[PDB]
Design a protein around this ligand. Structure first.
Ligand SMILES: CO[C@@H]1[C@@H](n2cc(-c3ccc(Cl)c(F)c3F)nn2)[C@@H](O)[C@@H](CO)O[C@@H]1Cc1cc(C2(C)COC2)no1
Length: 138
């Protein structure tokens, strides 16, 4: 393992056909996980599984601009389980990030931040044991 929080540099930012893979295990009494694709202080793409928001499991996605959170996009499809190994795959496409978990499509998130080549860090945090974080071009 690596110990969270972990920052993965994305040198020169991201580009369509770039596949980011995050392997780890959800901790047994997990409350939250976050991935933060950052352009400086802005968060181009925040991907935030919540295990107990009002006693429901929900995925919240958003963007932070000038330290202000925007409109949330929410999904009840929730593929994570406390205590289990996971794989998150974020595929950069021309108009969106595509997310699959454990080889099943989960969601798309339209690019609000347009300068993909300045989204130069991925922060990984929350209630996981982190096994690896890496990228390849498909
Ligand atoms: C309470 O702050 C959350 C955010 N958040 C989470 C974390 C975080 C930290 C550490 C770990 Cl380890 C982790 F896993 C984490 F997720 N940091 N920040 C973020 O999720 C955000 C997503 O919109 O919503 C909350 C903040 C929020 C929303 C709104 C609205 C007005 C509702 O519609 C927009 N305003 O403020």
């Amino acid at each position: 393992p690596l110990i969270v929080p972990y920052n993965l540099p994305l040198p020169g930012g991201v580009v369509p056909r770039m596949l980011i893979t995050i392997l780890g295990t959800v901790k047994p009494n997990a409350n939250r996980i976050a991935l933060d694709f950052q352009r400086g202080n802005d968060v181009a793409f925040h991907f935030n599984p919540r295990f107990n928001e009002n006693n429901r499991r929900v995925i919240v996605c958003n963007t932070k601009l000038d330290n202000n959170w925007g409109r949330e996009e929410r999904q009840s499809v929730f593929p994570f389980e406390s205590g289990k190994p996971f794989k998150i795959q974020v595929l950069v496409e021309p108009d969106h990030f595509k997310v699959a978990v454990n080889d099943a499509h989960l969601l798309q998130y339209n690019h609000r931040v347009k300068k993909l080549n300045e989204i130069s860090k991925l922060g990984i945090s929350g209630d996981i044991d982190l096994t690896s974080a890496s990228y390849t071009m498909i």
